[PDB]
Structure formats: structure tokens, C-alpha cells
Design a protein around this ligand. Structure first.
Ligand code: PX4
Ligand code: PX4
Ligand code: PX4
Ligand code: PX4
Ligand code: PX4
Ligand code: PX4
Ligand code: PX4
Ligand code: PX4
Ligand code: PX4
Ligand code: PX4
Ligand code: PX4
Ligand code: PX4
Ligand code: PX4
Lengths: 220, 220, 220, 220
């Protein structure tokens, strides 16, 4: 609590400081969208690559100062931890990790924190169902890998291939025309595997949303 | 408030006046559906093109009188502003803009105003989530444009192409058979991009509707 | 109220009488499923065609007696009117109309009447939205028929073709891969027509179900 | 209630006993996922096949002891009956039935029993609607088998083929591009069969979920 610590603390905790970050984030948002254009990279190529280094410097500077002012409390703050790693991740597909910077606009702007927290608060109630769901996939991914993986390697050769395909069946994306009707050319009873799979997986997802609705009706 | 202003005001505010517009709208609705038929345009070609000019005249006449009688209040009335521009838009793909006329049937008929207002009143609560949603698309549209846009220009070459495709993935339309399974031929880990994208985008849309339901349960 | 009228009335209003109809219906249900088999039609061909005449006789007999016993009240009873026409429709694709007989199993069995009435009672509240919905399709079916019907006759040549396709887009069935991406080969801005169409049509359907839920929460 | 019965009863009813089963189940879960790998079966082939015999022995031992300790009450316990048959089914596509073992992890772990019971408790209320639903499919499966089964055997030749296709149409999977648009090449009015089919089947599923939500709002 010296005159040195309170100097930085009054800057960091200032409203300008935050507005500066938000203003940066948004610019770097824009400029990363322009870096898409080969037209514009061909011209203003150097102007952007430094600007991304400048902003990560500023963000590192910023993320250091936030640590000083908060020390251990900073590492008990999701949004800081997020801002931490996202800036770290962007320091170290190399160029890709960068754009995660822009996710800070959620951390920085507090109407987003609000919304994001609303959505995340729903996830804890679901884990019980997600657990049953993921066990169910695991059991069925195994069955399908050995039932069909032989004559149908592309879709069910590995365990992970049956995982992907089964998740595809869950989304109902081409499940019949693209998968189960071809499987039936060889294994005419595969419909006994997949229609029950659809029913179960569907019913669960339905109930899940009913639960989400009713869990957020116990509060009203 | 002269004897001239009250003359028109008693006509405009009359019930016949409105019934006349509604009756027109519906006819012009019908006749624009017949203008679809090359058979019927080949015969009654002239009969319709003037009829659309007649009706826009009447609608301009009408939309003028509504302004006199209401002056500035007319430009603080959505439904008037809508009726205004829709008739203006139809005055100035040229022939297309016309058919927007028919949208007045919503403005004119008050059981539609009712329904339309019910739906629009939900939109303000959503913007917070839509904002987070559109930021999320923007970030991912950028990643996919550089991750895949090279070997896959048709789907991810521009930023807007990744936008369209990502919205397609959101609708789950052919997302696996049509997009992610082909991408995996080249980039075998693309599933790490798209399954999380689906989960997030899905979960949000789910919560959005839960919110819509619960926001309209705080009123009951 | 003679000794003749009360004779039939005590038979018609009996529990056996109803059990007999239900028992018939179910048999004719079964036998119509067997008439699917060319194998079984090749053998027991005559046995079934008379059995369907027998049952419609019995149903006509039955539907006459119900009229005697109830006279005008019979034509103020949906379920009778339904039973009426379904038996009439089956008297007069000829063979198809028959199978509608089986829909009486809903009329006859009262746990179905219950469920069916629960579902129908929801329809009156929706008409307002359905009206706005069908107007919206009509307006857009017109626009698409003239925007695209030329270079794309199969999907948008008539008005009804644009209706079908637009309903297909609503179901999100192949809307992008199958329709809007091909349209974009020629008309690169068609996405400005169809994404807004999807948004509107989607949002409405969402709200519709929210309304259905909340309209059946004003009762609790 | 001898000193012999209480010996086993105190073992079976112990917490270790259950932890041992759960620990086994999870291992056998893991090892059955590795038996997917031809790589790993080529090496550790014998190690796994006995391990599955060992575990079913233990599970048979276990499932015997549970019967002693509970006698007739064991056959009035779903979870036991389930554990019973799943172990029996795994004793007697031969190798497939095995993996059903892993479903015991639901029976064993009581946070799963909880979730599973929550979902099953919803099914009794639905049967009334499911009954109407399955009758409806039956009636329409019959109509489509005779309307289209001739020129379109692959999709509607048998009754079961029309069942599968109609369930596919219900899922909206390729219903137009893949089925109804081809049917329309020959039978141009098939849209009169399938759009109403979609509407009905959709509306019902919607209401079903509304019911599920409201039936679980009578408890709050
Ligand atoms: C955290 C950050 C928040 C700030 C968000 C900032 C939003 C604005 C970003 C703007 C980025 C614009 C990028 C852009 O235009 O890229 C170029 C591409 C394709 O152009 P290009 O490749 O040059 O084509 C050249 C063709 N030639 C040679 C014949 C002339 O152009 C296109 O393909 C069009 C791209 C349209 C992009 C629409 C962006 C919507 C952003 C919504 C953000 C919401 C945030 C809450
Ligand atoms: C679009 C997706 C964007 C993802 C951004 C992730 C940001 C993480 C933020 C976070 O976890 O917060 C959720 C909750 C809420 O904490 P809480 O302090 O109640 O929020 C206060 C909100 N306020 C300011 C309006 C009063 O915090 C907690 O309750 C604790 C959370 C622990 C960490 C969990 C992080 C999960 C998401 C991170 C995504 C990682 C991808 C692998
Ligand atoms: C409620 C929702 C339940 C969701 C169940 C799981 C859905 C995701 C399954 C999935 O997409 O797995 C794909 C991976 C990749 O397999 P892999 O064999 O590496 O690649 C397949 C495609 N290939 C060969 C052409 C490259 O497959 C694997 O290798 C296994 C993936 C991990 C198992 C599933 C983990 C999901 C846990 C639930 C996460 C919920 C977070 C809230
Ligand atoms: C409750 C749901 C109903 C369960 C009823 C289970 C009955 C099992 C009936 C098995 C029928 C059958 O023949 O299975 C074999 C078929 C076709 O194999 P096959 O005809 O031998 O293939 C010939 C081709 N070749 C030469 C390359 C071998 O291959 C298959 O398609 C076998 C499919 C069996 C699926 C069983 C999984 C049901 C999971 C239900 C989970 C509910 C929650 C616990
Ligand atoms: C704001 C306005 C409200 C008023 C709404 C008025 C509704 C009624 C509009 C009727 C428009 C009829 C248009 C029409 O039939 O167009 C022609 C087409 C195709 O015929 P065409 O091209 O002549 O084929 C000739 C073939 N040939 C040479 C071999 C004979 O025929 C078809 O393809 C059949 C088109 C069926 C259209 C169904 C319209 C439903 C309208 C629902 C409106 C609800 C409003 C709340
Ligand atoms: C909650 C829902 C969230 C929705 C996220 C956005 C979904 C829409 C994205 C979309 O379809 O964008 C398409 C445009 C057109 O790109 P463009 O490169 O012009 O054309 C692509 C196709 N091509 C080359 C063959 C002609 O892409 C662009 O050029 C960028 C479009 C603007 C960015 C997204 C704006 C949506 C804001 C949310 C609106 C909600 C209103 C309530
Ligand atoms: C939480 C979700 C999990 C996140 C885990 C991230 C782990 C990243 C692992 C990267 C794996 C990898 O090898 O990436 C490269 C692959 C394939 O590239 P590569 O094999 O080099 O392509 C060879 C072809 N050639 C010659 C033309 C270059 O290309 C890809 O497919 C890269 C895909 C990376 C997706 C990462 C984005 C995750 C977004 C999660 C957002 C959550 C909310 C904040
Ligand atoms: C209002 C009425 C209520 C009463 C409902 C009665 C339900 C039972 C109806 C049974 C109908 C059975 C029809 C049937 O099996 O048709 C034959 C077909 C195909 O056989 P087929 O064409 O003879 O194949 C010959 C092949 N060959 C020469 C090599 C031997 O066989 C198949 O393709 C199998 C068909 C399976 C049908 C499943 C029916 C489920 C009915 C659920 C009803 C619920 C009502 C609430
Ligand atoms: C809320 C849901 C809103 C639903 C909007 C309407 C959806 C149905 C539209 C539809 O499928 O229309 C198809 C017909 C047939 O057109 P048509 O040109 O005869 O045949 C097209 C295919 N072809 C040439 C290869 C034979 O198209 C027409 O000819 C016009 C059909 C009548 C107009 C739409 C009437 C639907 C009113 C809403 C019914 C709700 C009942 C509760
Ligand atoms: C709010 C939603 C945004 C509305 C914004 C409207 C802006 C209109 C911009 C028009 C763009 C344009 O160039 O339109 C023409 C394009 C392509 O035609 P074009 O390039 O001439 O085709 C060349 C081929 N050839 C030689 C055979 C003629 O053809 C098209 O793709 C035109 C598509 C126009 C769709 C406008 C309808 C918006 C409906 C919104 C309804 C909301 C509720 C009232
Ligand atoms: C009731 C039981 C509860 C216990 C659950 C235990 C969960 C862990 C199970 C692990 C199983 C691993 C199986 C595995 O890796 O299989 C091998 C495959 C493909 O490898 P492989 O076929 O050897 O490829 C050789 C290629 N070569 C020759 C060029 C080297 O590898 C793959 O394709 C990757 C497979 C990823 C599987 C992801 C599993 C997620 C399980 C989630 C369980 C949740 C339970 C609540
Ligand atoms: C609410 C949801 C309503 C669901 C309605 C029924 C949906 C399932 C219909 C279905 O997938 O049936 C397929 C079977 C197999 O027919 P089959 O002719 O053996 O094989 C067709 C394909 N092939 C020739 C290439 C091998 O078709 C048949 O053989 C008849 C199947 C039995 C009739 C439908 C029984 C479903 C009852 C509802 C179960 C709900 C449990 C809670
Ligand atoms: C309420 C819903 C509206 C119901 C209106 C019913 C009107 C029936 C109109 C029949 C039209 C018609 O021409 O049907 C025949 C068509 C095409 O057959 P066709 O043109 O003879 O085929 C020529 C090919 N060849 C040489 C191989 C024979 O084949 C078909 O596509 C006939 C389709 C008839 C479907 C009727 C079923 C409606 C079920 C509604 C259930 C509601 C809940 C009870």
C-alpha cells in the first residue's frame, strides 16, 4: 500500500483504463477481419502484423498490472484467468490462436459477462444428464464399431469414427439417406440399432431442455 | 382545425376509408399472384400494370391524407412509417419491390398488428444474446477463413463465405456429410473446430428460447 | 319414444354395441395391414374384399342407428360427423380411402378422443399467427417465383413451386446445399432473400410454441 | 436369518462390495473400448477375453448373492432385474451383447439411477399420445405402401418400408430432396400426402413436449 502501489492501482481501476482496452479489442477485432483480405494484406501487410504485436504488448502490460493490483485474487477471477490465458495463448495455426484475443470483448464488456454467466450457470445442473449421455454414446460407439466397422470403415472403423457418426445421427444430419439406408444394404437389421438410438438420444435432449426450463422456474 | 381540415379528417378517420384500403390491399394481393402466370399475363397484361399504378396512386393519396390529419404524429407511428416507406419503396427487381405493398395487410388489419407486436416485443430482450452470438460467429468466421479457406475456397474463401457456411452448420444442414466430413479428408482435426462450434451455438439457441419463455412468465 | 325407438336406443347406447364396433375396427385395421402383402393377397384375396364390404355394411347400419337415436344431435357431434363422412368416404385411389375407416378407432376409443381434443383445443389460439405466417409465405412465394423462377423453373417456376420450396426451406431440409447455394451460382445475392426468410419463419415458429406453452399456463 | 445368511448379507450390503462392482464395471468399460483396436487385440488378445469371463463370473457370483439376501424382493427391483438380465444376456453378435454389461454403471452409480428415473417417470404420461401417434403411422404407412410402393419399392414396397420412410420424413431427413420431390416426378400430387403428414406429426411432437413441460409444472 505504498505510494507506488496506489499509483498503478488508481490507473488500473480507472474507467479510462478499461475503455482503452475495450477500444483496443474492438480495433484489433476489426483489423483481424481485414487481415482476411489477400487484397488488403498485399498492401497494408506490415501495418497489421506489428499492430497485433503492439496490442499483445499492451495486453501483457495490462495483464501484469491487473496482477499487481489484485495478486492472488486475480487468479481467483475467471474473467482474469480467461484474459490471462487468452493473452498467453496469443503469445506462446500460430496466427489462428491470436484471434482468441477478441474473446476478451466478452470479458471486458460487462453486459456480456452478464449473458455469459447466465448461460454457464445452467451447465452444472446438466452434468448428471451429460454424464449419462456420454456413457450412452460410449457404449453405442463400441457396439457400432464392431457391428459395422468392418464393411463400413469410413464411418465406424475406429471408436472415434463411430463417435463422430453417432453424434451425426444425433443431429439427424443425413442419418437415413446418408448412413442407415446404406448400412441396410448390407446389414438389413441396422434399423434396430439406430432408431432406438435416435429415440433415446432424442428423448434425453428433450428432457434436458425441460429440466433447464423448470430449474429456472424454481427461481420464479 | 378549419372546416377544410375537419373535412378530410372525418374521411380519413372513417371506418369506410380503412375498409377501402384493406379491400384494395387484398385485391392487389390477389392480382399480384395472378401476374405470376405467363398464361394470364399473355392475356390480361395491360389490365394489371395500370391496376398497380392505380393502387399506388390511391395509396399515395391515402398516405398523404394520413400525414395531414396527423402531421408529426404520423412519423412517430411505426405502422404509418412502415406504410409510408412500403408505398415509397413501391414508387422509387423493380417489379419485386411492388409486392411489399401486401405487407400493409399486416398494418391495416389490427389482429395482425396485435400478433406482430407480440413477436417484436420479444426482440429487445434477446439483443444481449444476439450480440454475443454475432461476436461469436465473427470470431469463428475469421478462424475458419484462415484455417480452411485455402484448400476450400467455395465454403471459406472470403469472410462472408465462412459466415454463410457457419450459419449453415448452425442450421445443421448437411453440416457433416456436406462440409465437415469433406474438410476432414484434408484437415483431419477439423472436427475439433466444428463440434465445439455446434455445441456452443446450439446451447445458446436453447437458452435463448428458455429465456423467451421465462421472460414471458415474469408477466404471469 | 315408442316401444320401437327405445328398442334400438337401448341397443345402440349399450356397452356391447360400442365394444362390437371397436372390435371390428381393430380387426379391419389388422386385415388392411395384411392386404399389403402380395403374398397374402395371392392366397386369401377374396376373403378380405368381402370382409371390407361386410364391415362397411355394419358401419353403415351402425351409422344409421346412431342417427335415429340422436337425429339432429348426431349432426352436432364432431365424432359422429367424422364417423359419418369416414364411412361415407369409404363408400363413395378407391382402395386408399377405405383405410380412413381405421381413424374411427380414435372416435370409438375415448382415451383417444381425450388426447385428440387436447391437441385440437390448441389450434384456435394459433390461427392469428398461422394467418400472418401464410400471408408471409404468399408474399415471399410471389417474390421468389419472379426473382428465381426463370433460371430455376423446377423449384420456383409456378407460384405453388415457390410455395413448396419455401416450405422446404422452412423445414431447413437441404436449404443451403440443395437450394440456396445453387441459386447463388447464378444470383449471388439470393442469400439476402433466404437467410432473412429463415430468421423470420424460424422466430415465428419459436414464438408460436412459446405461446402454446404459456396459453396452457394461464390455465395453471 | 442364520449365522450363514447374515455372513453373506453383511458382505453384500457392504459399501466395499458395491465399490468393487463399480470399480470392475469401469475397468471392463475401459477394456472393452481397447478391444476395439486391432492393434491392441493383436498383442493383448488373450488378456482381455479371459478378463471378460472373469468379470461375468464375478457378476454372476454377485447377482446370485443379491438374490439370496433379497430373494423375491430382488425380482421386484428393476435395477436388479436389469442387472440380472444384462448379466444373463452377456452369458447366453455374440461379442456385442457383452458390452451391455456397461449399462450396469447406471444401475450401480446412484446419481445415474436418479437421472434415469427422472426420465422414465415422464414416459407413462406420454403413452396416450404415443398410442395415437403409432396408430397414425400405421394408417399412413398403409396408404403410402399402396399409393407409392409400386413405382417406388425401395422406400414403400413393404409395410415396414413405408414405416421407416415415414419415420424418416418425421425426422425431416431429406424428406423433400430425397423422397417427396422424386415421388412427385411420377405422382405429382404426393405433396398432398406428405405436407399434411408432416404438419400432423410435427404438431403432435410439439404438443407432447408442451405436455411434458406442463405435467412437470403441476408438481411446482
Ligand atoms: C471483438 C471485435 C469486435 C469488432 C467487430 C468488427 C466488425 C467489422 C469487421 C469488418 C471486417 C471486414 C473484412 C472484409 O471485408 O474482408 C474482405 C472480404 C473479401 O474481400 P477481398 O478478399 O478483398 O476480395 C477482393 C476481390 N477483388 C480482388 C475482386 C476486389 O469481404 C467480405 O467477404 C465481407 C465480409 C463481411 C463481414 C461482416 C462482419 C460483421 C461483424 C459483426 C461483429 C459483431 C460484434 C459484436
Ligand atoms: C461464447 C463463449 C465464450 C467463452 C468465454 C468464457 C468466459 C468465462 C467466464 C466464466 O467462467 O464465468 C462464468 C461464471 C460466472 O461467475 P460470476 O462471478 O458469478 O459472474 C458475475 C457476472 N457479473 C459481472 C455480471 C455480475 O463463473 C463461475 O461461476 C466460475 C467459472 C469457472 C471457470 C469455467 C470457465 C468455463 C468457460 C471457459 C471456456 C474454455 C474453453 C475450453
Ligand atoms: C450431451 C451431448 C453428448 C455428446 C457425446 C459426444 C459427442 C462428440 C463425439 C465426437 O465428435 O467425437 C469425435 C472424436 C474424434 O475421433 P477420431 O477417430 O480422432 O476422428 C474421427 C474422424 N476422422 C478419423 C476422419 C479424423 O471422437 C473421439 O476420439 C472421442 C471423443 C471423446 C468422447 C466424447 C466426449 C464428449 C463428452 C461431453 C462433452 C460435453 C461438454 C459440456
Ligand atoms: C429395445 C430395442 C430393441 C432391441 C432388440 C435387439 C434384437 C437383436 C436382433 C439381432 C438381429 C440380427 O440378425 O443381427 C445381425 C444384423 C445383421 O447381421 P448379418 O445379417 O449377420 O450380416 C451379414 C453380412 N456379413 C456376411 C458381412 C456378416 O446386424 C444388426 O443390425 C444388429 C443390430 C442389433 C442392435 C441391438 C441394439 C439395441 C440397443 C437398445 C438400447 C436400449 C437401451 C438399453
Ligand atoms: C395481402 C394479400 C391477401 C390476399 C391473398 C389472396 C390469395 C389468393 C391468390 C391467388 C393467386 C393465384 C395465382 C395462380 O394461380 O397462378 C398461376 C399458377 C400456375 O398457373 P400457370 O402458370 O398459368 O400454368 C399454365 C399451364 N398451362 C399453360 C398448361 C395451362 O397456379 C399455381 O401454381 C397455383 C398457386 C396456388 C396459390 C395458393 C395461394 C394461397 C394464398 C394464401 C393467402 C393467405 C393470406 C392471409
Ligand atoms: C442469433 C443468430 C446469429 C446469426 C449470425 C449471422 C448469420 C448470417 C451470416 C450470413 O449468412 O452472412 C452471409 C453474408 C454474405 O457474404 P458474401 O461473401 O457477400 O456472400 C457469400 C456467398 N457468395 C460468395 C457465394 C455470394 O456474409 C457477410 O458478408 C457478413 C454478414 C453480416 C455478419 C452477420 C450479421 C448478422 C447480425 C445478426 C442479425 C440479427 C437480427 C435480429
Ligand atoms: C474447447 C474445444 C477444444 C479446443 C482444443 C484446441 C486444440 C487445437 C489442436 C490443433 C490440432 C491441429 O493439428 O490443428 C491443425 C489441423 C490440421 O492441419 P494440418 O494437419 O497441418 O493440415 C495439413 C494440410 N496442409 C498440407 C494443406 C497444411 O487443423 C485443424 O483442424 C485445427 C482446428 C483447431 C480448432 C480449435 C478451435 C477451438 C474453439 C473452441 C471455442 C470455445 C469457446 C471459446
Ligand atoms: C385401427 C387398427 C388398429 C389395429 C392395429 C393392428 C396392428 C397389426 C397389423 C399387422 C399387419 C401386418 C402386415 C404384414 O406383415 O405385411 C406383410 C409385410 C411384408 O410381407 P410380404 O410382402 O408378404 O413379403 C413376402 C416375402 N417373401 C415372398 C420372400 C416371403 O410385412 C412387413 O413388412 C412387416 C410389417 C410390420 C408392421 C408393424 C405394425 C405395427 C402396428 C401398430 C399399431 C398401433 C395401433 C394403436
Ligand atoms: C404455419 C405454417 C405455414 C405453412 C405455409 C404453407 C405451406 C404449404 C405450401 C405447400 O406445400 O404448397 C404446395 C402446393 C402445391 O403447388 P403445385 O404447384 O400444385 O405443386 C408443386 C409441385 N409440383 C409442381 C411438382 C407438383 O402449393 C400451392 O399450390 C399452394 C398451397 C396453398 C397455400 C398455402 C396454404 C397453407 C395454409 C395454412 C394451413 C394450416 C392449417 C392449420
Ligand atoms: C431486411 C433484410 C434485408 C433486405 C435488403 C434488400 C436489399 C436488396 C438488394 C438487391 C441486390 C441485387 O442485386 O439483387 C439482384 C440479385 C441478383 O440479380 P442479378 O445479379 O441481376 O442476376 C444476374 C443474372 N441474369 C443475367 C439472369 C439476370 O437477386 C437477388 O438475389 C435479390 C434478392 C433481394 C431480396 C430482398 C428481400 C428482403 C425481404 C425481407 C423481409 C423482411 C420482413 C418484411
Ligand atoms: C461403463 C464404462 C465407463 C468407463 C469409460 C472409460 C472411458 C475410456 C475408454 C478408452 C478406450 C480407448 C479405445 C481406443 O483408443 O481405441 C483405439 C482407437 C483407434 O486406435 P487403433 O485402431 O489402434 O489405430 C492404430 C493405427 N496405427 C496402426 C497406425 C497405429 O482410438 C480411437 O479411435 C480414439 C477413441 C477415443 C475414445 C473416447 C472415449 C470417451 C469415453 C467417455 C466415457 C464416459 C463415461 C461416463
Ligand atoms: C412417437 C413416435 C412414433 C414412432 C412410430 C414408429 C417409428 C418406427 C418405424 C420403423 O422404423 O419401423 C422400421 C421397421 C422395419 O421394417 P422392415 O420392413 O423389417 O425393414 C425396412 C427396411 N429394410 C427392408 C431395408 C430392411 O418397420 C416395421 O417392420 C414395423 C415397426 C413397428 C411399428 C412401429 C412401432 C413403434 C411403436 C412406438 C414405440 C415407442 C416406445 C416408447
Ligand atoms: C386434409 C389434407 C388434404 C386431403 C385432400 C385429399 C384429396 C385427394 C386428391 C387426390 C389427387 C390425385 O389425383 O391422387 C392421385 C395421385 C397421383 O396418381 P396418378 O396421377 O394416377 O399417377 C399416375 C401414374 N401411374 C400411371 C403409374 C398410375 O396420387 C397421390 O398423390 C394421392 C395423394 C392423396 C393423399 C390424401 C391423404 C390425406 C391425408 C390427410 C390426413 C389428415 C388427418 C385425418
Amino acid at each position: 500500500g505504498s505510494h507506488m502501489y496506489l499509483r498503478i492501482t488508481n490507473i488500473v481501476e480507472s474507467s479510462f483504463f478499461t475503455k482503452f482496452i475495450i477500444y483496443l479489442i474492438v480495433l484489433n477485432g476489426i483489423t483481424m477481419g481485414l487481415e482476411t483480405s489477400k487484397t488488403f494484406m498485399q498492401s497494408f501487410g506490415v501495418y497489421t502484423t506489428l499492430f497485433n504485436q503492439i496490442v499483445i504488448t499492451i495486453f501483457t502490460i495490462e495483464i501484469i498490472l491487473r496482477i499487481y493490483v489484485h495478486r492472488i485474487s486475480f487468479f481467483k477471477d475467471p474473467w482474469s484467468l480467461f484474459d490471462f490465458f487468452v493473452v498467453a495463448i496469443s503469445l506462446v495455426i500460430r496466427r489462428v490462436l491470436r484471434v482468441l484475443r477478441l474473446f476478451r470483448l466478452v470479458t471486458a464488456v460487462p453486459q456480456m459477462r452478464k449473458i455469459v454467466s447466465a448461460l454457464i450457470s445452467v451447465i452444472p445442473g446438466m452434468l448428471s444428464v451429460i454424464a449419462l449421455m456420454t456413457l450412452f454414446f460410449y457404449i453405442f460407439a463400441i457396439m457400432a464399431t464392431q457391428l459395422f466397422g468392418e464393411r463400413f470403415p469410413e464411418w465406424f472403423g475406429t471408436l472415434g469414427e463411430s463417435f463422430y457418426t453417432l453424434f451425426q445421427v444425433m443431429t439427424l444430419e443425413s442419418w437415413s439417406m446418408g448412413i442407415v439406408r446404406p448400412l441396410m444394404e448390407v446389414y438389413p437389421y441396422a434399423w434396430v440399432f439406430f432408431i432406438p438410438f435416435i429415440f433415446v438420444v432424442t428423448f434425453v435432449m428433450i428432457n434436458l431442455v425441460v429440466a433447464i426450463i423448470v430449474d429456472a422456474m424454481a427461481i420464479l
